[PDB]
Amino acid sequence: GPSVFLFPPKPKDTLMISRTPEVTCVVVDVSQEDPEVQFNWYVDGVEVHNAKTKPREEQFNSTYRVVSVLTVLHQDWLNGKEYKCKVSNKGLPSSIEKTISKAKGQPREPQVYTLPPSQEEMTKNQVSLTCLVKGFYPSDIAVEWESNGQPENNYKTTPPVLDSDGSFFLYSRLTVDKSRWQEGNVFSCSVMHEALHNHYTQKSLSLS
């Protein structure tokens, strides 16, 4: 039969009040002849009705795909409430249910360190600025870079990695022209996480 997948919101969306965290329920392998797909949502057991459901969409393997999107309350997601998507077809009683929630467990605050380029990289045209982020729980987290009050784009961040003590760590690498680093520019690694004061902290880095 069909398959259902339930996806959490983005960490950044849950941590900033101004953004719109959403839980997404995706049904694949729907058949043309299947009666209209229906979605019931529950939040900690209670049915709710603000979900937006998109009309079904043909995939190339001759199946259909259906998505229902539930806007969630930041506080609720962070409080560890359980979102349940229940999926069925208009007429038949059979249904499929899926449940998701934030990771359970004592949250830990991330320590954020900045590392300048290795002296050995200094001979190249571009250098790597490193941001180590360690000791955090849960793994849901967001890392960004900026400079001169404007976002930097040329960075990549590793996935969270599980440490011995059950916390997570990761690295972020911002690549910049040597000429920009030694002119004395300040670069900032920004980290967003539920255990940080105001869900936010920032650590800066320039040539010493």
Structural domains of the chain sorted by starting position, each given as residue range(s) with its CATH number in brackets: 1-101 (2.60.40.10), 102-208 (2.60.40.10)
Helices and strands (H and E) in the chain: how many: 3, 18
Q: Hey, is 20 helix, strand or coil?
A: coil
Resolution, expressed in angstroms to one decimal: 2.3
Q: For residue 70, report the phi and psi dihedrals to the nearest 5 degrees.
A: -110, 115
Residues in the chain: 208
Experimental method of this PDB entry: X-ray
What are 30's strand-pairing partners? Answer: 64
For 196, phi and psi rounded to 5 degrees?
Answer: -80, 150
